[PDB]
Design a protein around this ligand. Structure first.
Ligand SMILES: CC(C)(O)c1ccc2cncc(NC(=O)[C@@H]3CCNc4ccc(Cl)cc43)c2c1
Ligand SMILES: CC(C)(O)c1ccc2cncc(NC(=O)[C@@H]3CCNc4ccc(Cl)cc43)c2c1
Ligand SMILES: [Cl-]
Lengths: 296, 303
C-alpha cells in the first residue's frame, strides 16, 4: 500500500554527469561514450562557436579533466568529442516525449548530482521543476528494462518560475528559444488521462468515496472538461486506461462521471491519496508500474 | 525557482542491493563490505510470525541455508549473527561498490530517501519522513522488506531505515540499521496499530519560509504569538508541540526572510483557522510537513 511521486533509480545517469566550463560559464554535461552533450548557450551561435578551440572547453568528470578533441553543434545542443570513452556508459536511447508523459530529473550543479524528482511535460511544453542557477545541462529520463531513455536537457527558467529545455537532439519542447528575450509559458491545462489514472490508483488503494452509479459519453465528458481547462480525452486515452478499468471493475466513462462530479462540486473537505487537488503527474503506465513492483 | 519533494540520487545505494532467500521467503539485503544486512523475519514462515522465537529458528540454520544473490552472481555466506531485529550475513566477497557510509538513528520529523526494491532489484526512489507516531507513509508492496532509507549529505551515505512491515492502515514500520525498531512495534503478526498521527509543526513552518523565499507572502499577517499560546492552538488541530529547539533550528530561515519565528507561527495559526480560500502554497492546497528546515535550506535559493 501507499502511493508516492516516485522517480526511477538515478545511478545509471549519475555515472554520466560531468561539469563543462567555457569562459566564465559553468554548467552540466552528459558524457556518453566519447561525446559530452550540453546546452549550446555555454559558448549567432555559428559565429561564436567558430571562434572557439577545443582547449577552450574545460570538461571535468569527478576529479579528472577530460580533453576535448572535437566539437559540433546539433540544434540547441553542443557535442564535445572527448579523448576518453565513459566506462560507465549505460545502454541508452535518445527519445522525444509528448506532453502528458512523465520522467525523472537528476538535478546537478557543477557536474555533481544533488537530487532526483519526478515530473511531467505540461501541455504548454514547460516542466514545473526545481532548478537554481547552474542547473543547465541537468537531464530527464525514463528506464525501460536496463536501457536509459534520455528525453530532456534543462536550458532555462521562464519568468513564472517554470522550466524549458530540449530533447537530447537539441530540439526545444515548446515555442521557446535559447536566448535572453521576452518569453512566457502559454496558458496551461490539466492532463485528463493522468487524473483518471490517479483516480484508479486511489481506488486500488481503497479510496472509493468519489465513485458513483453514473456513466457519461465521451462527447458530454469533453464538453464539461473543456470548461474546466482540462485537456480533451481521446479514444486513445480510453484504450490506454483499459487495464486499470479491468483491475478495478470501473469503466473509463464510469470514472469520467466521477471526475465530472469532482470538477462541478469539489472534494467537500475530503482528500484523495492525501491530496486536496486532482493530481495529473502520474500516467496510466506509472500507476501500473508502482502498483505492481516493476524493477530496474 | 520551484519546490519539489526531492530525493537523494540513489546510485550509491543501488550498488549495495542484494536478494536474500531462506527457504521459501525472498527479500532484500544491504551489502556493505563483507556483510549483508536484512530483516530477521526472512527465517520465518507465515505461521512462525504469530509468536516467533527467532533464537530457536536461527540455531537450526547453517550458512548454506541462506542464498544471497548480487546481480547474476551468488555470494557465499560464511557466517551469521543476529543483532536486535536484523540478521547480519557474513559473505566471502567484500562489495567493491561499498560507498563511504554511517548508520544513523533518526528522530520523528526527520526526512529521508527510500530506494524501494524487489528481488534485490531497485524499482524506484521517493522522499518521505519519520512520522511523529514512528511510522512512514511509504509505497511498498509485498517483497519490499529489506528496502532502505538514507540521506547523502556530501559523499557519505547515512543509512537510517530498513523496511520490515506494513500495518493495517497501510502505513509502514521498520528499524534503524542496528535492528532497533522505530516506535512500539515488534516483528511479529500481532495486533499492533499506529498511534494517532500528528502534523510535524517545525516542518510546516520551514515550508512556509520556503514559500516566502520563492515569492509568496499572501498568508502572512500583522500579528505575533507567544510560544505557549501557539501550542495551545496547534494541539487543537493535532499539530505537534513546537519547542524552543524548533524555534532555534528555524533561526537561519527567519534571518534570510526577515520574518520572526513567532510571527510565522501567527500566520500558521491563521491558516489553521481560515484554510486557504481557493489558494495554494508552493502548488499545494494542504499544509506540507515532509520538508525539514535543513531540506528547505538545501533546495531553496540563498537569495
Ligand atoms: C534568475 C536566474 C539567476 O538567472 C536563474 C534562476 C534559476 C534558473 C533555473 N534554471 C536555469 C536558469 N538559467 C537560465 O535561465 C539562463 C540565465 C538567464 N538567462 C537565460 C537565457 C537563455 C537561456 Cl537558454 C538560459 C538562461 C536559471 C537562472
Ligand atoms: C498485507 C500484505 C499483502 O501481506 C503486504 C502488503 C504490503 C507490504 C509492504 N511491506 C511489507 C509487507 N510485509 C509484511 O508486513 C510481512 C508479511 C505480513 N505480516 C508481517 C508481519 C510482521 C512482519 Cl515484521 C512482516 C510481515 C507487506 C505485506
Ligand atoms: Cl534526526
Amino acid at each position: 500500500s501507499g502511493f508516492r511521486k516516485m522517480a526511477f533509480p538515478s545511478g545509471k545517469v549519475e555515472g554520466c554527469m560531468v561539469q563543462v566550463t567555457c569562459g566564465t560559464t559553468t554548467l552540466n554535461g552528459l558524457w556518453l561514450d566519447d561525446v559530452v552533450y550540453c546546452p549550446r548557450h555555454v559558448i549567432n551561435y555559428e559565429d561564436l562557436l567558430i571562434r572557439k578551440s577545443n582547449h577552450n572547453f574545460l570538461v571535468q568528470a569527478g576529479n579528472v579533466q577530460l580533453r576535448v578533441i572535437g566539437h559540433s553543434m546539433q540544434n540547441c545542443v553542443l557535442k564535445l568529442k572527448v579523448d576518453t570513452a565513459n566506462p560507465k556508459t549505460p545502454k541508452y536511447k535518445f527519445v522525444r516525449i509528448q506532453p502528458g508523459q512523465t520522467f525523472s530529473v537528476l538535478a546537478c550543479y557543477n557536474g555533481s548530482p544533488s537530487g532526483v524528482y519526478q515530473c511531467a511535460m505540461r501541455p504548454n511544453f514547460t516542466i514545473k521543476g526545481s532548478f537554481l542557477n547552474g542547473s543547465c545541462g541537468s537531464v530527464g529520463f525514463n528506464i525501460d528494462y536496463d536501457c536509459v531513455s534520455f528525453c530532456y536537457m534543462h536550458h532555462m527558467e521562464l519568468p513564472t518560475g517554470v522550466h524549458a529545455g530540449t530533447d537530447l537532439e537539441g530540439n526545444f519542447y515548446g515555442p521557446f528559444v535559447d536566448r535572453q528575450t521576452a518569453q512566457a509559458a502559454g496558458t496551461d491545462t490539466t492532463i485528463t488521462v493522468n487524473v483518471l489514472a490517479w483516480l484508479y490508483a486511489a481506488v486500488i488503494n481503497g479510496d472509493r468515496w468519489f465513485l458513483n452509479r453514473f456513466t457519461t459519453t465521451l462527447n458530454d465528458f469533453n464538453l464539461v472538461a473543456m470548461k474546466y481547462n482540462y485537456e480533451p480525452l481521446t479514444q486513445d486515452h480510453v484504450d490506454i486506461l483499459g487495464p486499470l478499468s479491468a483491475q478495478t471493475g470501473i469503466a473509463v466513462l464510469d470514472m469520467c462521471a466521477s471526475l465530472k462530479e469532482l470538477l462541478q462540486n469539489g472534494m467537500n473537505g475530503r482528500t484523495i491519496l492525501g491530496s486536496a487537488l486532482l493530481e495529473d503527474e502520474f500516467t496510466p503506465f506509472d500507476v501500473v508500474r508502482q502498483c505492481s513492483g516493476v524493477t530496474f
